[PDB]
Design a protein around this ligand. Sequence first.
Ligand SMILES: O=S(=O)(O)c1cccc2cccc(Nc3ccccc3)c12
Length: 159
Amino acid sequence: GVFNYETETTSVIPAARLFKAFILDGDNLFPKVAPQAISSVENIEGNGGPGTIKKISFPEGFPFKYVKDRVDEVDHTNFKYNYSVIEGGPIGDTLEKISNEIKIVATPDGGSILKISNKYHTKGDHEVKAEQVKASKEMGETLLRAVESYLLAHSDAYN
Ligand SMILES: O=S(=O)(O)c1cccc2cccc(Nc3ccccc3)c12
């Protein structure tokens, strides 16, 4: 079945720039700005649109070795990005996939709000518990803050 978790968070970076950097160039940026959270990002198949598979490797000592993420949809107009965790880490005989949706909305103060949905699809009925969702939110927030700091310090990046 499906467990749905939603959260919101804010950024001081304008939506279109954040989307370009944080969403569209995560493969380059994440290992660069947050090597302590993501060791590498490998493009396995696809040119960036629906169906593109990436392998995200975590550094030694992390709970999981890697996940493979599949790009589901990329909306350049409305700053929406949907992707699914389809292999590795928590995926296996109890969890089929985690389907994620991210939308970035402009705010009049020149920042943005990120609205995030994560839907865990389980095999049989055993539950997703707070600890796995908490860890996921922590990682996402660490990645956001690292990218934000980089975009603040490198004004010519992603204009
Ligand atoms: O979805 S993620 O792709 O990890 C993600 C991507 C980008 C930014 C995120 C910010 C906060 C939490 C996330 N994950 C999250 C995890 C559990 C519950 C709610 C949000 C973020």
